[PDB]
Design a protein around this ligand. Structure first.
Ligand SMILES: [Zn+2]
Ligand SMILES: [Zn+2]
Ligand SMILES: [Zn+2]
Ligand SMILES: [Zn+2]
Ligand SMILES: [Zn+2]
Ligand SMILES: [Zn+2]
Ligand SMILES: [Zn+2]
Ligand SMILES: [Zn+2]
Ligand SMILES: [Zn+2]
Ligand SMILES: [Zn+2]
Ligand SMILES: [Zn+2]
Ligand SMILES: [Zn+2]
Ligand SMILES: [Zn+2]
Ligand SMILES: [Zn+2]
Ligand SMILES: [Zn+2]
Lengths: 268, 270, 269, 268, 270
């Protein structure tokens, strides 16, 4: 937590306020608590709404990934319930569904999905997927072809084909949703306004408290600053849900969970 | 929580007797800065509790869907296949097993007794062998529906109508699992929890100059309001958690089971 | 009975006025600043709570709105798809009407026996009353009517499905209402707020008297009224199926539903 | 806006407060700002949440009408894509769909729909619709009859019938949604509490401000009153989305847009 | 952001307050901080709710546009999966889908869609689209005709037609959603009340602060002014998500992405 640096900086500003409080009158500068209460409350209100937006975004990201697991579970269930004897098809479709999850992760992380794809799919399909400017989307197309062939071969009717196609649609909404969350952030002018106001507020605060608090200034000023900064920093942690950091989504573990689930449901 | 109130009373008594030595050291605590701090904390508690409440509401909605989806699936089975009571009973057993297994999964308790009560031991072994027992129960229910389809008893259309309900259930399973792995905040909530505590303990020292002897009464009142609101959010954030009220989840599982034995002629007594 | 607490608050103000003399001689001082902090905090919490209570009221109203919608369309489908099956129209409508009234009784915790006998043959009434969820049984019975039309070949699996969907929709309503009936907002929210607001309002004049003196009861009652009004409104909204003023006129709503369904089946009241 | 009357009344209350401030001590009345800050902030908080609720219902009303345009567009699109040669059926259904919109408009406005109906439908149908206690619902039923007849004639299969039947369902949800918004208001106790509280607050305020502000009382008091009154009055205007008031939904314009759209998609 | 003018103007009001504070008594003017704390906090609350509503519009607008990409992707996927050999139909339908996006953008931006339409479609079709008072809707209708013809030719069954028909409706919901956001703005009385109120508050503020702050008045007044003014103007920008401002939707980039996706590899699919 690099929050400690500005807390330390805040302690230093408090010490300056205490020793420089002498020259306050000799300059004509006074700072009371009342105007900073107004400012502080206004900032708290705006921080509240902002964090709310950051929170909703983090939650949606969690929701989208939850849907991958749900839709892939049911698609495999449908394949077993409707075509219990078609395990060759079971394995092929499962490999694509598993590939989709990993490919989505790599896409959001901007990493190379090549190794994971080669572990799951024949090289012909991997080349075919990587040739696309939108590889994760290309993967859905391939899963659709597998289902499409079962339809053409008469193993799936249009009805049962439709039941499985619906699940691919659910995955498509996940892909677009994540892509939307990745390119659209909470707008950058929310963060600038708040960062500029919060930092300036905390550093000016001890100068406004010193008249009332004297020697207790650094303790109370640090308490108030810590409160605003903790709340402000919470938004920063929630804003990067697809990242690698510790408070980011465990996408690797999630992908492993998805793969473990699908191989549990096909006897592998 | 009552303990932190008593601790707050002691801090007030300390504040009263130690207020004497304040000047000869130069330490001052006025109400205005703690008014600022208090209102900000209240605002954050408001928004935090709002998020917690949202999580609680979703958890109940998800569980309501279990009750709804299972009711209609059984209704469809009777309306579409009124004579297939062997199939009725087996599927009902899986749906009931699903609810209890879901409850046990979210509560991290042993589902063995409920499973052995409802299903033949062969399936219980199969379900317990899986790392995802609740999902396996859905898979087994799906097989029952799938077999009726191959026997020609269900068409693809009527199969699809029932298949949708298994989908209404899978979404619930994933939804609860997401709510279970949660919280969202990375235990930054702990900070927030502590912030309220430090505020309540520092409060009497800031009030004593104005309130004097009346300090412990007003200080404990304010503390009670903040601590209560904080603990309420804590309870709402974790609807499936370690220290939670299980009367609803248990009543719901009982309600679901009572309904399905109600819609399959197993109730009342002949 | 909020008027009682307003009158009681006036009395507490008078106590504050007459006892302000002995304030110094006891060692008690009460300033406004700490009570502004406490008061604003409570207002914030009342604000969020009241918002939640309203949402719950709106949802309950929505669910009942869906009953009217789904039942209208089910009857519409029956006439459009099976225009000659008027016996089936009548039986299904009677079940749909029974469903609404039964839902009302379930939410009001009252006896549906009289309404059921007015609408259905006694054999069906007994079957429905025997169930732990009579509304669910009514949906099941309505489902049998559609199911029997399907077995007779009058409905295909597709057209059966279109109607089965409306029964899905009613079930989703039943569960929603049930969820709202069994869930209150958590009690710890009403307990915190009701005790806290009351205690705050009665302690307030003791804190105001030093500034306001004789003007204490007027300002104290105004502030108390604002907080109490907002608090009591939330509790009424929290119980949308209850008897209190701003609750759902469920009886009128069921009458509306029944008149609608008899309008679309050529019957007159 | 009759708020200007209450602002002037507030200026009147301030001048009274100024001239009567003399007799304050001689009566035993003291009024400080602090208790009114508490009350004022509380009122603002409740006004904030209330206005939020009013805005949301206005938004729902607009959404419901948006759905009318969407569902009717696609129903007409479907009729054409599925039955391009059945123009007799096209016109009849379009007239019903247009009548539905106008009938809904008149219903929410509590006005007479007769001319709009007679302009769109043969008198034979109009009397039947007007004879019902629920004319808009009867129009959906009649639109349903047209689709049902196309099915019985074998022009629509059960599947394609179902595709259009779904659109009638969307319209049914709109009708119910609108009716609910019309009969259920934001509860009258939100208006009752807030108007009494806001008005009494604004009139009592100068008496509490005069001790501190004196001659500057009317300016600061009217500003505060204007802020609260404007925000309160905004909520009332939003609470009645189907009304005649300028900031209400342009339902007449919306119905014209719908009619123009459907006749645009039928070569009319 | 023209706030920089009003901030400098606020510095001007502060210097006036400082030099005239002596003459307060000689005029009969008294101004304390307390009433302006009340007024300021009320304004902050209302700004909070307003900005929240504005963001809500921004989020929905972004969602509607996201759906365009999703629905159009799956429609093409379905065409490839169900009719893998009908590439002539693929190309015609894709162009309509691409035309739909650009036409929607121009409609919301009130610009001329002629150039984009001629780039994607034959002139005969362009005139038909331009002849309609609602070109975006006409494009969906034409895309619908393509699907409808494949059905009449026996290439699509009623079932598979329906699967694709559903996606066109999804696009219709986007079109209606955007039009609602475009034709209905937030009520004009939100901008009127708040802009006047915030500005008047910020300029009057230093006159009330000078008694406490003296020489520090311009610094604190501009700080408070920046906070209120920034939040207000951002709200203004987000309320018009289809506008040209910098915190608005990059509609041009979005349409390019949609076109690139559907025309990913000269329309080549496996
Ligand atoms: Zn799903
Ligand atoms: Zn297999
Ligand atoms: Zn990160
Ligand atoms: Zn049975
Ligand atoms: Zn029973
Ligand atoms: Zn419906
Ligand atoms: Zn009939
Ligand atoms: Zn359902
Ligand atoms: Zn639609
Ligand atoms: Zn035509
Ligand atoms: Zn003709
Ligand atoms: Zn008339
Ligand atoms: Zn979609
Ligand atoms: Zn192609
Ligand atoms: Zn000065």
């Amino acid at each position: 937590s690099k929050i400690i640096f500005r807390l330390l900086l805040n302690v230093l500003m408090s010490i300056i306020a205490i020793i420089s409080y002498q020259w306050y009158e000799q300059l004509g500068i006074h700072l009371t608590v009342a105007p900073f209460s107004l400012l502080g409350i206004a900032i708290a209100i705006f921080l509240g709404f902002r964090n709310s937006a950051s929170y909703s975004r983090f939650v949606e990201a969690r929701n989208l990934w939850g849907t991958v697991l749900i839709a892939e579970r049911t698609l495999v269930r449908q394949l077993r319930n409707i075509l219990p004897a078609e395990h060759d098809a079971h394995r092929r479709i499962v490999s694509y569904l598993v590939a989709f999850s990993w490919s989505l992760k790599h896409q959001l992380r901007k990493t190379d999905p090549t190794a994971d794809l080669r572990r799951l799919l024949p090289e012909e399909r991997v080349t075919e997927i990587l040739a696309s400017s939108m590889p994760t989307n290309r993967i859905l197309l391939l899963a659709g072809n597998e289902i499409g062939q079962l339809r053409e071969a008469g193993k799936l009717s249009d009805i049962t084909y439709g039941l499985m196609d619906n699940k691919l649609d659910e995955l498509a909404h996940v892909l677009g949703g994540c892509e939307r969350l990745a390119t659209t952030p909470v707008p950058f002018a929310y963060t600038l306004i708040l960062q500029r106001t919060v930092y300036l507020f905390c550093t000016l605060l001890p100068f406004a408290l010193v008249g009332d608090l004297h020697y207790m200034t650094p303790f109370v000023s640090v308490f108030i600053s810590y409160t605003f900064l903790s709340w402000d920093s919470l938004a920063e942690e929630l804003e990067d849900p697809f990242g690698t950091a510790a408070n980011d989504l465990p996408l690797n573990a999630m992908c492993n969970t998805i793969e473990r689930n699908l191989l549990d449901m096909t006897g592998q």
